[PDB]
Ligand binder design. Structure first.
Ligand code: HPA
Ligand code: HPA
Lengths: 338, 338
DNA sequence: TACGCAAACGTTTGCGT
DNA sequence: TACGCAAACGTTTGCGT
């Protein structure tokens, strides 16, 4: 079809191309003629013809886990902004933590020759680490590890541990000593790492967490619902709960409410993520904020770099969580004794 | 690179191609040889070379509005599933209701030669209708109109009006006569249409909605927060509120709570959307359910059809909302008198 | 000066044999 | 029998003039 434009304007295709991309000087008249032809013919240059020739698609691949979840959804929306801004195209892919699904999306991606790869798989068993290596040739950044588990990718790190410790500390400082915890999947950074940060703050404080006070969640509201229940559904119960993700938290608030428990009056709750509408939880949620956008933009950035500046050496940038006081926590019995 | 495989296996490229796509019979040995070469060379066939030749990218474009919002997020996640299943690729694009952004994504898309287009723009001013027409050549379905506003696309319709009427009715039947409403943007189907369905149910019931009881929202929790406030922040106040979107609802619950109002005891609330975690609102939200996935799959389907079966004539499938009783509503003063 | 030539990018697929 | 030939898809870009 570029050929069709050329001839309407009676110039070579080279000419047409150049005008379209301002890639060399073209007489005004010539330039107009082309634009004109371009207009009538209603011409849309093919990006595929072009990618074929130039060797880059100017499109990037996001190999995610899931995309509905607030946490995720929030990141992803940031990532798209960045692509758009730098004229990249976003191919969103959810592998649902399924290897097969993951090998699949992976290959489609390479086939579609994405300039780079954004990775958000949540859990990294060896097999997955393995596959990934198989594509080291395609530049990519992992956005969800706590440390850098490989030398063949960039990593943006969140300090999940330090956020976890921040949480316990707060409780402690608010007069609390009988606490529970509903962590997310241990096979995840945001799961294992937050918990550990949190557990450290406890040991330092000589506070012990009775195993009946720790209940595993899966980051979904139902999981929070069940745990909260299980925790409060017991003889002796904590006065405060550390909940590993705001959504699970929302589920824990529901249950308390359902058992007719008062928050924070009867139980204090601290979440983690500071999702866009945690302030609208009832009550407004006190939580740990994760810099979602910085998280996004930052990764998009390392990628671009490796892409354009052809970096070769793995890099890794840290990001920092931070406390956000809202109204789900109340002073504990030991407040005054400090 | 296909050339490199050919020669390692000492067969023509045609051969290589055929084996790769099982497109004609190939001797076993030959077939193996190729696979072998394919393996060592670590070959990834280029989809772009292929798309160039075959004339279709096997990738689809979602021109959305925003993607964080629960409602949206939910749809989109469904759409991806479908693409994946039928081996399509999803290019997610958010135009944020901005024309420029929209003309932009639109063109990038055509350039990338997407097989079809999924449209979710929320608001359709003429200019936008205009642009869209300019691409009638690319098959597309609009997933967010109440009726079919053009003859050059497929439309999947939700019966937003009938859901709105369902809502009012319920209130009415629960003993309510003093009701308020926080609608979403009138420039939208889910805004205008829900409200109107709702207003019809009222007129039929000879219930009048004092303009001070109707407050515009924008589908965001803050908007619900403000409206609820404004409504209850008044001398005389309704006993029940119809809130146009679950998220805005969540914001309305917060405020009530903040003014120390009891739900549903002091005020009853009915939402709309039945978002994945409306059951975890506190209290569990009574709302109107929108068939999000059917919504997604269904559109993906008309698209595919038009794509493959080369349909040419516009089509339109309706979908149906439905009531979901949870615990945010309570009997009204007129219950017994019916 | 301001532009055109033709090879090249990586596959597919209608004829042949 | 089981496979190879060469044109074609739609751009880009190094030489020339
Ligand atoms: O894996 C996760 N899923 C959902 N929300 C989350 N917030 C932190 N980690 C996660
Ligand atoms: O436009 C909308 N935005 C967000 N949520 C919604 N739910 C229905 N319509 C909408």
């Amino acid at each position: 079809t570029i050929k069709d434009v050329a001839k309407r304007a009676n110039v070579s295709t080279t000419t047409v191309s150049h005008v379209i991309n301002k890639t060399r000087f073209v007489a005004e008249e010539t330039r107009n003629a082309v634009w004109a032809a371009i207009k009538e013919l209603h011409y849309s240059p093919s990006a595929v013809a072009r990618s074929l020739a130039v060797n880059h698609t100017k499109s990037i691949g996001l190999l995610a886990t899931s995309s509905e979840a607030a946490y995720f959804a929030e990141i992803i929306e940031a990532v798209e902004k960045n692509c758009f801004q730098k004229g990249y195209t976003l191919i969103l892919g959810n592998a649902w933590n399924n290897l097969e699904k993951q090998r699949a999306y992976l290959s489609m991606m390479a086939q579609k020759r994405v300039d780079g790869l954004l990775v958000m798989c949540s859990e990294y068993p060896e097999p997955l680490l393995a596959m990934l290596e198989e594509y080291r040739h395609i530049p990519m950044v992992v956005m969800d590890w706590g440390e850098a588990k490989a030398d063949f990718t960039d990593a943006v790190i969140d300090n999940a541990f330090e956020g976890g410790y921040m949480a316990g500390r707060y409780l402690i400082e608010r007069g609390h000593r009988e606490i529970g915890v509903i962590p997310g999947p241990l096979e995840r950074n945001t799961g294992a790492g937050r918990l550990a940060g949190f557990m450290k703050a406890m040991e330092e404080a000589m506070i012990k967490v009775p195993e009946s006070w720790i209940v595993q969640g899966d980051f979904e509201p139902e999981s929070g619902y069940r745990a909260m229940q299980q925790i409060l559904s017991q003889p002796h119960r904590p006065t405060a709960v550390f909940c590993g993700g705001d959504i699970m938290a929302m589920g824990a608030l529901c249950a308390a409410d359902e058992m007719g428990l008062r928050v924070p009056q009867d139980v204090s709750l601290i979440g983690y993520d500071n999702v866009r509408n945690a302030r609208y939880f009832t009550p407004a949620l006190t939580t740990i904020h994760q810099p979602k956008d910085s998280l996004g933009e930052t990764a998009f950035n390392m990628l671009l770099d490796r892409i354009v500046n052809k970096r070769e050496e793995p890099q890794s940038i840290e990001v920092h969580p931070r406390l956000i006081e809202r109204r789900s926590v109340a002073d504990g019995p030991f407040r005054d004794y400090r």
